[PDB]
Amino acid sequence: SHMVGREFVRQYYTLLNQAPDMLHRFYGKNSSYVHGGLDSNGKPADAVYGQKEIHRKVMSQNFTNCHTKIRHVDAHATLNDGVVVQVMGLLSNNNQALRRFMQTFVLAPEGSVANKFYVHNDIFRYQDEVF
Amino acid sequence: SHMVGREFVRQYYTLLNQAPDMLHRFYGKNSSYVHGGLDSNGKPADAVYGQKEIHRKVMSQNFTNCHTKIRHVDAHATLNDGVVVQVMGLLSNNNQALRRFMQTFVLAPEGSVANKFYVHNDIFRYQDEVF
């Protein structure tokens, strides 16, 4: 267990604020991205795979000036020296009201220098969509 | 991605209600368990490792008649055909008021028959401890 993920969250949401279109560089060809959703009834949204499809859904959601302030991060370890991260903070896309969320990250070793890994899984959900 | 974790949550919280002392059978010698916490100031609690220490903290928290009703579960896939689970529901230990929580599971292949895996990571947090 190390703070590799803690310093990874340090740069993730910073990128999500500045250039959300560059967020796809974190993901490989074996990554799982989940956001939103709903969609569109009430049941949780589906998952997208592949860097081409992940970037496609990120651009669709439009993180225009999406500011973030995290309040809690849990980072430990898993298989292949991978660090799992449980994120819980507040999100505000396009200067909207803050939304409590629970996000989970899976970071697998990159392949060159092995840091700061690459997001193998990105499951994001809003609390207001569940209660 | 498969509903292996969905049918795993099916039996996890059921065990947490009935026999919380048997919950340690899910974990191996390389598992990470987090609950509570706080503790005890305000900062998030530490993580325990090893089946002997995990069971030690579970028994301490006393899940006496701890009933649970999950409202959302996200299960996909990771490395070594492992299924990650993001749980979000309501918890009530000892017939207390319901508490919104966000729990994350990492399920690594067992070694014999390979289902229903074994909990490699169990990070649990209450929302009321964060906001």
Author numbering:
A (entry chain A), B (entry chain A): 8 to 138
Tell me, in the authors' exact words, what the paper reports.
Ras GTPase Activating Protein SH3 Domain Binding Protein (G3BP), a 52 kDa protein highly overexpressed in various cancer tumors, has in the last couple of years proved to be a significant cancer marker protein and a potential drug target. In addition to the PxxP motifs, G3BP also contains glutamine- and glycine rich regions, an RNA recognition motif (RRM) and an N-terminal NTF2-like domain ranging from residue 11–134 in human G3BP1. The NTF2-like domain forms a homo-dimer with each molecule composed of three alpha helices (αI–III) lined up against a beta sheet made up by five beta strands (βI–V).
Initially, we were focusing our studies on the G3BP1 11–139 construct under the assumption that the N-terminal residues would be disordered and likely to interfere with crystal packing. Initially, we obtained hexagonal crystals of G3BP1 10–139 diffracting to around 3.3 Å. The 3.3 Å crystal structure of G3BP1 was solved in space group P6322 with one molecule in the asymmetric unit whereas two molecules describe the 1.6 Å structure in space group P212121. The low resolution structure was determined using combined molecular replacement and SIRAS phasing. The structure was refined to final Rwork and Rfree values of 30 and 36%, respectively, including 131 protein residues and one phosphate ion. Two loop regions, Gly43-Ala52 (loop III) and Pro116-Phe124 (loop VII), proved difficult to model but the electron density, including an un-biased density modified SIRAS map, suggested that these loops could tentatively be modeled, providing at least an approximate location. The phosphate ion occupies a special position in the crystal lattice, surrounded by six symmetry related copies of Arg107. Crystal packing is denser in the G3BP1 1–139 structure as compared to the 11–139 structure with estimated solvent contents of 42 and 56 percent, respectively.
